[PDB]
Write a protein that binds this ligand. Structure first.
Ligand code: A1JHA
Lengths: 196, 198
């Protein structure tokens, strides 16, 4: 059911857990961020333990692993958001109806590089200069190049137009962004609070 | 895993099952339909057996049953649509990103009718090139609801000082609900497709 690295929730279903600086889990997530954002200052990293979001995501993951006949469907990506959206994402995940640029489709956008999500247009500095970025488990699955105005990914072969790609990208050979068009294709795993 | 009265699907993920008149299952849907739509005639009623949509929907239902306090969270509602949308809905369900602007808008989501007569309007159940009209009968997790408003992209909060604790859906009128709007994927399961004609 619930992942091993999660800590006890006293029979509750939602908790934001601040990570201890210098332990393995904190160090792994900090490393992913500082690869492109070494010039920023990390205030804290919180593990998001949202049982409902996790359950709905794990269901979609098992479905995509069955449909794709292989289990290489997940990537870790970044998502910058404004402070006022943070409670929403913690509790409800990412909502294409809320989503800035949509040149590759009307979905939720995720960056390969923290540096892209660190842009003020995405991770808007709050009145205290705090910026907020998620590390997100994303079911990118089998992907294709996106285009403006997509409401879902294109068909995997427009002879069978309901069999869809899982996500779209800017560039299939060297992707820097992914767009997903369904709820529960993305699990917000950590929230990084940082400053310029 | 799947309802024990579904047809054996032979490790296939999706089947449409044609129902037989005189069976309770057909006759109950026909009665629900003809209660407001006696001037149309049913061609056929198909049960939709979509394993993945059922799984995702049932998880959302379990979640809402846990969250809410012994509420009847699920209603059986109608959805009229055009022929062009039927294969998508059968396979992928109801997508708010594809939704029509309703003549009376209570938010930017997917609309479901209490009365078949509403879904039977040509604006929704557009007759195809053969004069067939299509209406789903849908399990909808309405949960705890409030009157909607045209600007909504999710249900409103129950409490403006806790913006993330949302109503489950919105309606046109809480005293006499005739439509519901839902704003999330897997909150509605297309259970039957009614094909009907003038
Ligand atoms: O981290 C993000 N948070 N919120 C976003 O909307 C977002 C958007 C985003 O790509 C937008 C885009 C569109 C077209 C061309 C581009 F080069 C880039 C990348 C990251 C983010």
């Amino acid at each position: 059911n619930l992942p091993e690295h999660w800590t006890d929730m006293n029979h509750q279903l939602f908790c934001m857990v601040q990570l201890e600086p210098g332990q393995s889990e904190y160090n792994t997530i900090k490393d992913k961020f500082t690869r492109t954002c070494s010039s920023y200052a990390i205030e804290k990293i919180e593990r998001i333990q949202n049982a409902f979001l996790w359950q709905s995501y794990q269901v979609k993951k098992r479905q995509m692993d069955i449909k794709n006949d292989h289990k290489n469907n997940e990537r870790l990506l970044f998502h910058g958001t404004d402070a006022d959206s943070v409670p929403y994402v913690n509790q409800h995940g990412f909502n294409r109806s809320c989503a800035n640029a949509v040149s590759y489709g009307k979905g939720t956008y995720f960056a390969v590089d923290a540096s892209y999500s660190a842009k003020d247009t995405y991770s808007k500095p709050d009145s205290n200069g705090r910026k907020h970025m998620y590390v997100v488990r994303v079911l990118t699955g089998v992907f294709t190049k996106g285009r403006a105005g997509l409401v879902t990914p294109p068909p995997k072969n427009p002879h069978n137009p309901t069999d869809l790609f899982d996500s779209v990208t800017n560039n299939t050979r060297s992707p820097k962004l992914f767009v997903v068009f369904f709820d529960n294709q993305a699990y917000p795993e950590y929230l990084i609070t940082f400053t310029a």
